Design an enzyme around this catalytic site. Structure first.
Site, PDB file in Angstrom:
ATOM      1  N   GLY A   1       0.802  -1.204   0.000  1.00  0.00           N
ATOM      2  CA  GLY A   1       0.000   0.000   0.000  1.00  0.00           C
ATOM      3  C   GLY A   1       0.838   1.258   0.000  1.00  0.00           C
ATOM      4  O   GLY A   1       2.071   1.237   0.014  1.00  0.00           O
TER       5      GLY A   1
ATOM      6  N   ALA B   1      -7.808  -0.007  -4.463  1.00  0.00           N
ATOM      7  CA  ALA B   1      -8.949  -0.618  -3.794  1.00  0.00           C
ATOM      8  C   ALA B   1      -9.956   0.403  -3.278  1.00  0.00           C
ATOM      9  O   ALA B   1     -10.940   0.011  -2.642  1.00  0.00           O
ATOM     10  CB  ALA B   1      -8.471  -1.494  -2.633  1.00  0.00           C
TER      11      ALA B   1
ATOM     12  N   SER C   1      -0.682   0.007   6.060  1.00  0.00           N
ATOM     13  CA  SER C   1      -1.632   0.806   6.816  1.00  0.00           C
ATOM     14  C   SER C   1      -2.839  -0.036   7.216  1.00  0.00           C
ATOM     15  O   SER C   1      -3.122  -1.083   6.631  1.00  0.00           O
ATOM     16  CB  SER C   1      -2.087   2.018   6.001  1.00  0.00           C
ATOM     17  OG  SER C   1      -2.646   1.615   4.760  1.00  0.00           O
TER      18      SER C   1
ATOM     19  N   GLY D   1      -7.315   0.562   1.632  1.00  0.00           N
ATOM     20  CA  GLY D   1      -7.952  -0.620   1.071  1.00  0.00           C
ATOM     21  C   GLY D   1      -6.953  -1.698   0.696  1.00  0.00           C
ATOM     22  O   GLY D   1      -7.209  -2.890   0.893  1.00  0.00           O
TER      23      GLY D   1
ATOM     24  N   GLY E   1      -3.665  -1.585   2.017  1.00  0.00           N
ATOM     25  CA  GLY E   1      -2.948  -1.842   3.254  1.00  0.00           C
ATOM     26  C   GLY E   1      -3.618  -2.889   4.118  1.00  0.00           C
ATOM     27  O   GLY E   1      -2.965  -3.796   4.635  1.00  0.00           O
TER      28      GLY E   1
ATOM     29  N   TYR F   1       3.568  13.813   5.060  1.00  0.00           N
ATOM     30  CA  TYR F   1       3.909  12.399   5.163  1.00  0.00           C
ATOM     31  C   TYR F   1       5.412  12.194   5.280  1.00  0.00           C
ATOM     32  O   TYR F   1       5.856  11.258   5.956  1.00  0.00           O
ATOM     33  CB  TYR F   1       3.352  11.629   3.965  1.00  0.00           C
ATOM     34  CG  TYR F   1       1.888  11.270   4.106  1.00  0.00           C
ATOM     35  CD1 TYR F   1       1.355  10.929   5.345  1.00  0.00           C
ATOM     36  CD2 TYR F   1       1.036  11.283   3.007  1.00  0.00           C
ATOM     37  CE1 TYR F   1       0.016  10.602   5.484  1.00  0.00           C
ATOM     38  CE2 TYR F   1      -0.306  10.960   3.135  1.00  0.00           C
ATOM     39  CZ  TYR F   1      -0.809  10.621   4.377  1.00  0.00           C
ATOM     40  OH  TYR F   1      -2.141  10.297   4.515  1.00  0.00           O
TER      41      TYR F   1
ATOM     42  N   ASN G   1       7.150  10.131   8.166  1.00  0.00           N
ATOM     43  CA  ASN G   1       7.821   8.892   7.786  1.00  0.00           C
ATOM     44  C   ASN G   1       9.264   8.855   8.274  1.00  0.00           C
ATOM     45  O   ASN G   1       9.708   7.845   8.829  1.00  0.00           O
ATOM     46  CB  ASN G   1       7.755   8.705   6.271  1.00  0.00           C
ATOM     47  CG  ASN G   1       6.362   8.353   5.794  1.00  0.00           C
ATOM     48  OD1 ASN G   1       5.532   7.883   6.574  1.00  0.00           O
ATOM     49  ND2 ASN G   1       6.097   8.575   4.510  1.00  0.00           N
TER      50      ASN G   1
ATOM     51  N   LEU H   1      14.209 -12.949  14.185  1.00  0.00           N
ATOM     52  CA  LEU H   1      12.798 -12.595  14.320  1.00  0.00           C
ATOM     53  C   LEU H   1      12.099 -13.411  15.399  1.00  0.00           C
ATOM     54  O   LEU H   1      11.117 -12.945  15.989  1.00  0.00           O
ATOM     55  CB  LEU H   1      12.082 -12.768  12.984  1.00  0.00           C
ATOM     56  CG  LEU H   1      12.514 -11.786  11.901  1.00  0.00           C
ATOM     57  CD1 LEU H   1      11.702 -11.996  10.637  1.00  0.00           C
ATOM     58  CD2 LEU H   1      12.373 -10.362  12.410  1.00  0.00           C
TER      59      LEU H   1
ATOM     60  N   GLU I   1      13.226 -13.990  18.236  1.00  0.00           N
ATOM     61  CA  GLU I   1      13.515 -13.374  19.527  1.00  0.00           C
ATOM     62  C   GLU I   1      12.489 -12.307  19.887  1.00  0.00           C
ATOM     63  O   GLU I   1      12.161 -12.140  21.068  1.00  0.00           O
ATOM     64  CB  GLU I   1      14.924 -12.786  19.515  1.00  0.00           C
ATOM     65  CG  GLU I   1      15.519 -12.563  20.893  1.00  0.00           C
ATOM     66  CD  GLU I   1      17.015 -12.818  20.921  1.00  0.00           C
ATOM     67  OE1 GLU I   1      17.551 -13.301  19.897  1.00  0.00           O
ATOM     68  OE2 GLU I   1      17.651 -12.540  21.963  1.00  0.00           O
TER      69      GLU I   1
END
Ligand SMILES: Nc1nc2c(ncn2[C@@H]2O[C@H](COP(=O)(O)OP(=O)(O)OP(=O)(O)O)[C@@H](O)[C@H]2O)c(=O)[nH]1
Ligand SMILES: Nc1ncnc2c1ncn2[C@@H]1O[C@H](COP(=O)(O)OP(=O)(O)CP(=O)(O)O)[C@@H](O)[C@H]1O
Ligand SMILES: Nc1nc2c(ncn2[C@@H]2O[C@H](COP(=O)(O)OP(=O)(O)O)[C@@H](O)[C@H]2O)c(=O)[nH]1
Ligand SMILES: Cc1ncsc1C(=O)N1CCNC(=O)C1
Ligand SMILES: [Ca+2]
Ligand SMILES: [Ca+2]
Ligand SMILES: [Ca+2]
Ligand SMILES: [Mg+2]
Ligand SMILES: [Mg+2]
Ligand SMILES: [Mg+2]
Lengths: 425, 438, 352, 54
Positions: B10, B99, B140, B144, B146, B224, B228, B252, B254
């Site tokens: 997205g 979307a 997000s 739609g 995300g 944004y 960001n 990952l 952990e």
């Protein structure tokens, strides 16, 4: 590349559509011959949303002109930007419609619709990705109303998953050509309830009162009314024709505005509206105060008589986006009773740095109020006042219609009014 | 060494992924053309940074990333941006029409027609992996794509990679930047279908990042880009352990072990300090105790809530810069005697600390000021459930009138999936209460 | 034009504030479900604090401190005093208390029996009182067997604390009483004491040899107006205000209310509020809180003040509703939302 | 206030401090879901065309 196909039908549709293309053609630097002569790249960033690009860097509006008589379109072809429209996109007959919905929907229109759809299909096949169509038209005549809604019924059949938006001029006895306008409007409104995603309700009475009271015009003309529409039409399509943190097409805009498939009839608004004190600077609080003022509404409906299901404002110009947020939140907070609480944050706002011609900053309003039901009540009453005596029906029965079709359109609209009423409580 | 594949779904996920890989490159000293002088092993190696970057015989360091958007205008910025040379075309996937903020459109209608293409481009990165750990999915809630397409991707990633871990970085909806009224619907729809497929999820409330930008950065109306660059700071602080030599959060698995004792409650709260404006004349550098104390101020959390009235299940301290354990313990002890820090009786009252001596890297020209030390706390409070309550409440207001439901049904979704997903959240909100209240 | 909403129709205090705010012509009340409000006169139980302070452009204020139930619950107050270093277990202004869970459900059954047996052996006064938050249900007894058995018959948590066998008795009448103080905490956490308290006196002469008839032992306004036959005899509605209670202390005990009682009360108010200030302060929170409290004290024959309980949603005395409610709007509401003296409060300064 | 599992390296160190001790759908079932929704879209579109034909 998210193209929109424009269709303008009838006298009203084509006269307004012309001014619309004149207004935005100037905003995008396109001249009457289609040659770009601007000074910013923002003018060409989204130029392909409404314009096709031909040889020699020419831009041709993706517009399809339709009428059952040649009169109005001949003028367009002779108007300021008449040369900018694709010749093969002028589709017209000779019989006319006689301000008769049945002539536009069933007889005269039927004979010409296939040829219009051949142009529509020809414009779509060249679209990298078609967002959807938009139609400008009146509901009180014969072509724009009768054949327009016929075009919508056939465009939906061939493009069932494309967004259909219309700019619809509603008839008012104060600005009337003929007494059968309520007949043609009631018949068309039912078509629009079924086959359009968004309908910009433009009441000719509101357009008159604004020209008379606010703009201080002693005797308004159809041109004066169309100037308002040209400016408002350019206002709502600003976010579509220019860049910004918006990223919104017709389907995404419809999703945020239409809580229910049949309640998609919006009240437009514009600000400023000044008479000729016209050089004064308009502050952001002023734009917001006016834009929510009923006197700036063009649907002749008092919003304080209902509740906003959703709202969208589109500010234009270099202004304090912080001050914009503050003022938008001020209107909602100081009047939160007029916004349904079962749809959180139903007021959205967009900004565009490029303002209209000769306007430092402006605001265009798009309201989905339940107070719009007052508009359909006017038409319904005027309808019933005549249909109870079956007055003037012979024009319609003579083209093959039956009184039953009238009684049903009468019911469909009275249903539509009851549906708004249930969500107002 | 084991690789990590990043997936940005997205507009929110792609623009945030763009901000992170820009930052990853500054830190690891990778240039916009993919060249890394400090990397002495050319076209190969198993360093800690190679978990996020692959290499080419030409010494180029290529992110292990995949950008997926159902409309191409946002990913086209990546194709022509400063870091256009990092990625190759296969990595950037774009559709034709989005979307329209419609979950059912991104999950079903449009999602069905592109999912296989995605899994293919993901399988190409997986084949460059000797030992893939899992995926970091940036997306997000309200979008739609995300929400809708991500939950479908998550369902299929749990199929084609049943043993790999999946972590989310999820943007919570904030009206001050959103233009979509149906985001409560989408958010809850995607939490429902993604919950069992995600092992750890970091929610970032746009409301939080917005105030942190107006308060600490003195940005009147943050864009944004402002939101960001700040989010990629917190993301960097979180993924630093996977990209640098260390022993805390080294793979990952952990994250789940140290942060999520109960599977469903895998939404740790993140708190970052300090955030200092670069336009400041010159800031008095904060101490270990000062920045560590700010980790318990709600005004620095990624999700505004009040941990004082929840119960902690875990807690990590990720320091970067001039920090030594002695100073950490000193500030911790001082904070235990001044702060309300209630843990769950079935979990120890402790803090896992990680320290990287390299201080936060700041994007040249950005809004953040270079600091000597910084910390990011990853605590698992029941207090974050406040965010579900807000969201769930809004869902109930609209769905009571079936408002907007017709858009989803028209795309193939059944009205019952709404109440099915809303009941799950009712169960999610209950667990949080079972574990937090007495 | 500030906006507020009412979610507690049964609150007489804020019913008058909502009435006063409207009378200012600058405050507009909304539906109880409209979230675009400046102020929330919230409900008592399960007030949704998590849904506050997330309305852009609205400074939101609520009339309850999240977490203040730690101080306003019978079993919570005891646990807070014994376990808080600021108050310690050796707290001298609070009666020895113990939390007792009914056997049908930590629990302090054996700890209470230890001290009880010590008093039984040492010939000391061993009369306790058992009560709970689920009461309109109280039992005053000197035998531990009756106290523990009375709680098992119930299903809720109770607390047993030492009953004040030597309560200060007003004369004429030889009757008991308790003192009610209203304390308003604003968003900044200033502790304001209302200059006007009330003594809810018993019209029945205190009888230390008959705890069965609880009409001369319980000074609740509802018990004296239902089971007491001398109601309204000495003072109107069994309610003495500070002016009279002060003059009496001067004539009878040759001292003032400020010196002999008020200093201890202000010290108790500060000690409790400053204790939980870190746990409920809304200084750096996305919303602000204020709350009105009702402290109930006891005075023994040595003129020592004891804390009975703290009321989180207290009601006022019929005479003082006007003055107090206007004070709530002045320092609590208008302090954050100003409108376009000689304070009625005593600011108890402290270190934040 | 106990420190444990202290690890040190060139680019930082990590430890743990204890302040107090304690007290899926197959690939088949997904294709069916995605196709059940496409069928409701076809049925809906058929009722529209059936409607437009009348
Ligand atoms: N923090 C942050 N939030 C963003 C960003 N871009 C969009 N959002 C938020 O994302 C939500 C909308 O979702 P999008 O990501 O824009 O939509 P999408 O995923 O592209 O899906 P579509 O509907 O197909 O466009 C809103 O709440 C926005 O505020 C971003 O760059 N940073
Ligand atoms: N330890 C003790 N010693 C002496 N009297 C006591 C006591 N505990 C309670 N009382 C008596 O009980 C009365 C108040 O009881 P308590 O306040 O505990 O119940 P309650 O909370 O339902 C009344 P309210 O909340 O309105 O003040 C006082 O009048 C007091 O005389
Ligand atoms: N605003 C505006 N309204 C018009 C214009 N022309 C006609 N109308 C209105 O449209 C209705 C007449 O429809 P018309 O377009 O003339 O019929 P058609 O040519 O068959 O479509 C009446 O209600 C008129 O008030 C115009 O140029 N501007
Ligand atoms: C709904 C709509 N229909 C035609 S234009 C339009 C619009 O301009 N906006 C402004 C931006 N955000 C919206 O939600 C709607
Ligand atoms: Ca003919
Ligand atoms: Ca290498
Ligand atoms: Ca799994
Ligand atoms: Mg005409
Ligand atoms: Mg998008
Ligand atoms: Mg009580």
């Amino acid at each position: 590349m998210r193209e929109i196909v424009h269709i303008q039908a009838g006298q009203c549709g084509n006269q307004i559509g012309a001014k619309f293309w004149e207004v935005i053609s100037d905003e995008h630097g396109i001249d009457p011959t289609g040659s770009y002569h601007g000074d910013s790249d923002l003018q060409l960033e989204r130029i392909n949303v409404y314009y096709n690009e031909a040889t020699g860097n020419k831009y041709v509006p993706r517009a399809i002109l339709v009428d059952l008589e040649p009169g109005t379109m001949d003028s367009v072809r002779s108007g300021p930007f008449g040369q900018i429209f694709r010749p093969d996109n002028f589709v017209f007959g000779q019989s006319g419609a006689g301000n008769n919905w049945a002539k536009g929907h069933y007889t005269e229109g039927a004979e010409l619709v296939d040829s219009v759809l051949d142009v529509v299909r020809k414009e779509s096949e060249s679209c990298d990705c078609l967002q959807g169509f938009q139609l400008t038209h009146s509901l009180g005549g014969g072509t724009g109303s009768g054949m327009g809604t016929l075009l919508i019924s056939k465009i939906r059949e061939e493009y069932p998953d494309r967004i259909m938006n219309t700019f619809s001029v509603m008839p008012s006895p104060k600005v009337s050509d003929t007494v059968v306008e309520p007949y043609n409007a009631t018949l068309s409104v039912h078509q629009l309830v079924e086959n359009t995603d968004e309908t910009y309700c433009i009441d000719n009475e509101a357009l008159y009162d604004i020209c008379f009271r606010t703009l201080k015009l002693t005797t308004p003309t159809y041109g004066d009314l169309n100037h308002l529409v040209s400016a408002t039409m350019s206002g709502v399509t600003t976010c579509l024709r220019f860049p910004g943190q918006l990223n919104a097409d017709l389907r995404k805009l419809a999703v945020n505005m239409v809580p229910f498939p049949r309640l998609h009839f919006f009240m437009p608004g514009f600000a400023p509206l000044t008479s000729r004190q016209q050089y004064r600077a308009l502050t952001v609080p002023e734009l917001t105060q006016q834009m929510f003022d009923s006197k700036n509404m063009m649907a002749a409906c008092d919003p304080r008589h209902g509740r906003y299901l959703t709202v969208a404002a589109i500010f234009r110009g270099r202004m304090s986006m912080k001050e914009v947020d503050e003022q938008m939140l001020n209107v909602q907070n100081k009047n939160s009773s007029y916004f349904v609480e079962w749809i959180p944050n139903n007021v959205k706002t967009a900004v565009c740095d490029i303002p209209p011609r000769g306007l430092k900053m402006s605001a265009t309003f798009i309201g989905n109020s339940t107070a719009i039901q007052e508009l359909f009540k006017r038409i319904s009453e005027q309808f019933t006042a005549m249909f109870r005596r079956k007055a003037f029906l012979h024009w319609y029965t003579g083209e093959g219609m039956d009184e039953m079709e009238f009684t049903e359109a009468e019911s469909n609209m009275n249903d539509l009014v009851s549906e708004y009423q249930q969500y107002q409580d | 060494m084991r690789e990590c594949i990043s997936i940005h779904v997205g507009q929110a996920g792609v623009q945030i992924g763009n901000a992170c890989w820009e930052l990853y490159c500054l830190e690891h000293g990778i240039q916009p053309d993919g060249q890394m002088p400090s990397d002495k092993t050319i076209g190969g190696g198993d360093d800690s940074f190679n978990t996020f970057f692959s290499e080419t015989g030409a010494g180029k360091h290529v992110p292990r990333a995949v950008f997926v958007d159902l409309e191409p205008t946002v990913i086209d910025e990546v194709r022509t941006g400063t870091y256009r040379q990092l990625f190759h075309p296969e990595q950037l996937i774009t559709g034709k029409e989005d979307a329209a903020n419609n979950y059912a459109r991104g999950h079903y209608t449009i999602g069905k027609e592109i999912i296989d293409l995605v899994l293919d481009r993901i399988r190409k990165l997986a084949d460059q992996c000797t030992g893939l750990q899992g995926f970091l999915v940036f997306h997000s809630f309200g979008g739609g794509t995300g929400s809708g397409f991500t939950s479908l991707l998550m369902e299929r990633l749990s199929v084609d990679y049943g043993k790999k871990s999946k972590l989310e970085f999820s943007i919570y909806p904030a009206p001050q930047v959103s233009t979509a009224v149906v985001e409560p619907y989408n958010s809850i729809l995607t939490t429902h279908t993604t919950l069992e497929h995600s092992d750890c999820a970091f929610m970032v409330d746009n409301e939080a990042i917005y105030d942190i930008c107006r308060r600490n950065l003195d940005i009147e109306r943050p864009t944004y880009t402002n939101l960001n660059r700040l989010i990629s700071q917190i993301v960097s602080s979180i993924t630093a352990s996977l990209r640098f030599d260390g022993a805390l959060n080294v793979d990952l698995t952990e994250f789940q072990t140290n942060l999520v004792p109960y599977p469903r409650i895998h939404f740790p709260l993140a708190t970052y300090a300090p955030v200092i404006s670069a336009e400041k004349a010159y800031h008095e550098q904060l101490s270990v105790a000062e920045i560590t104390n700010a980790c318990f101020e709600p005004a620095n959390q990624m999700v505004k809530c009040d941990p004082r009235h929840g119960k902690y299940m875990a807690c990590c301290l990720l320091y970067r810069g001039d920090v030594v354990p002695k100073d950490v313990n000193a500030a911790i002890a001082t904070i235990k005697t001044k702060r309300s820090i209630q843990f769950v009786d079935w979990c120890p009252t402790g803090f896992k600390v990680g320290i990287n001596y390299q201080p936060p890297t700041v994007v040249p020209g950005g809004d953040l000021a270079k600091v000597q030390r910084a910390v990011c706390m990853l605590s698992n409070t029941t207090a974050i459930a406040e965010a579900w309550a807000r969201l769930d409440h809004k869902f109930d207001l609209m769905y009571a009138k079936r408002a907007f439901v017709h858009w989803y049904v028209g795309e193939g979704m059944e009205e019952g999936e709404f109440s099915e997903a809303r009941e799950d959240m009712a169960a999610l909100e209950k667990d949080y209460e079972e574990v937090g209240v007495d | 034009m500030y906006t507020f909403v009412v979610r507690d129709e049964n609150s007489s205090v804020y019913a008058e504030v909502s009435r006063l705010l409207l009378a200012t012509g600058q405050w507009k009340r909304l539906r109880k479900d409209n979230p675009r409000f400046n102020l929330m006169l919230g409900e008592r139980n399960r007030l949704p604090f998590g849904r506050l302070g997330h309305e852009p452009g609205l400074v939101q204020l609520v009339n309850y401190y999240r977490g203040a139930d730690k101080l306003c619950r019978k079993a919570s107050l005891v646990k807070l005093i014994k376990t808080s270093p600021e108050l310690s277990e050796s707290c001298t202004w609070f009666p020895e208390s113990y939390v007792i869970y009914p056997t049908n459900l930590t629990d302090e059954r054996e700890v209470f029996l230890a001290a009880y047996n010590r008093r039984r052996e040492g010939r000391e006064g061993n009369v306790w009182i058992a009560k709970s938050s689920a009461g309109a249900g109280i039992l005053i007894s000197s035998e531990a067997s009756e106290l523990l058995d009375f709680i098992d018959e119930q299903g809720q948590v109770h607390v047993i604390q030492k009953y004040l066998e030597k309560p200060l008795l007003l004369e004429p009448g030889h009757r008991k009483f308790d003192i009610r103080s209203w304390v308003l905490v604003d968003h900044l956490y200033n502790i304001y004491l209302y200059r006007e308290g009330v003594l809810r006196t018993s019209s029945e002469p205190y009888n230390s040899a008959n705890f069965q008839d609880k009409t001369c032992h319980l000074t609740n306004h509802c018990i004296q107006k239902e089971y007491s036959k001398n109601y309204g005899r000495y003072e109107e509605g069994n309610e003495m205000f500070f002016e009279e209670f002060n003059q009496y202390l001067m004539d009878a005990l040759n001292t003032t209310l400020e010196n002999s009682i008020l200093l201890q009360i202000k010290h108790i108010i500060r000690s409790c509020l400053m204790c939980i200030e870190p746990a409920i302060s809304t200084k750096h929170l996305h919303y602000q809180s204020f709350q009105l409290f009702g402290f109930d004290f006891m005075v023994d024959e040595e003129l020592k003040v004891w804390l009975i309980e703290v009321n989180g949603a207290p009601a006022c005395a019929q005479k003082l509703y006007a003055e107090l409610c206007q004070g709530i709007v002045d320092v609590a509401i208008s302090s954050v939302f100003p409108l376009a003296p000689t304070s009625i409060f005593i600011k108890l300064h402290h270190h934040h | 206030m106990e420190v444990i599992e202290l690890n040190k390296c060139t680019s930082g160190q990590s430890f743990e401090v204890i302040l107090k001790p304690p007290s899926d759908p197959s690939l088949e079932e997904i294709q069916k879901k995605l196709e059940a929704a496409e069928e409701r879209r076809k049925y809906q579109e058929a009722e529209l065309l059936k409607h437009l034909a009348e």
